[PDB]
Every structure is written in C-alpha cells, then in structure tokens.
C-alpha cells in the first residue's frame, strides 16, 4: 500500500519517528531478507533530513539501529 | 537461490549477457514492480563493468535497455 522507496525524513520530525515509520513499510514491504538489509543500509541514511543524515554518516555502515536512535535522540522537535 | 543484489558484470562479459542475468534474476526476486524499477536505475549500473558503468552514467536513467545495449555493443569481449 506504500513503498518503502517513499518514505523520508521531515526537517522537524524526530529520528524515531522516520525509522518506526521506516520499518513499518518496510515489514510490509514483498522481499528477500538481504533485499531488505539493503534497503535499509541504502534508503534509511540517503532519505534522512540533512543532520540526521551527517550524524548516520560519522557512525559508517555498520552501525545498529539502537545506536542510530540515540546518536540522533539527539535532534528534532517533537 | 541467487539475489539481484550480486549480479556483477565481468571485465570481458558482453553487456546483453550481463542484461540478460540480471532481469532473469530480478524476474526471479520477490519484490514490488516500483522497487523492481529501483532496482534497475539502481543496481545494473552500479554492478556494470566499468566501461559500461561509464557510458550508462552518461546515458542516464531510464534509458530503455535495447538503447543501453545498443550504446554498450563495442565494449569488451565476446563472452560465453
């Protein structure tokens, strides 16, 4: 009912919120388990509002999804 | 099975050969037709040789790929 390939981060919205709405599509979302690892590592830092996205970077690729919440906790309003 | 998401272009491999893998592969992936699109703008230029990388870049997305072929024909070897 939507792709995951629409979802990003608003200029206010909290991290949190763009990564629960993140996983929500991405649950429903029809592919393989390694298709969705790489959505995630591709999709969820390039559709970051610009200081999210520069904090995702300074962290690098293998970073968790915990460790991303609270290094972005962080910034936003809400 | 195989994933779309290692489906490389060999230095030598004829760029049809490389086209014909990676849509028999993606024909084959589990996944909607707007991220199957993705995939394609995506990952078949990224995982091209990189001869063919170059000329797609500047060809750019979308793109139909008899024109993609058509633009990469004189690159490389002849295959297998």
């Given at each position: 009912p939507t792709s995951?390939?629409?979802?990003?981060?608003?200029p206010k919205e909290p991290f949190r919120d763009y990564v629960?709405?993140?996983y929500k599509?991405?649950?429903?979302?029809?592919?393989?388990?390694e298709?969705?690892?790489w959505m995630t590592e591709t999709l969820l830092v390039q559709?970051?509002?610009?200081?999210?996205?520069?904090?995702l970077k300074?962290?690098?690729?293998?970073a968790t999804?915990?460790?991303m919440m609270t290094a972005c906790q962080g910034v936003g309003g809400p």
């Open positions: 995951i390939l629409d979802i990003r981060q608003g629960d709405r993140f599509t991405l649950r429903a979302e029809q592919a393989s388990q298709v969705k690892n559709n970051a509002n610009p200081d999210c996205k520069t904090i300074a962290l690098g690729p293998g999804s915990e460790e």
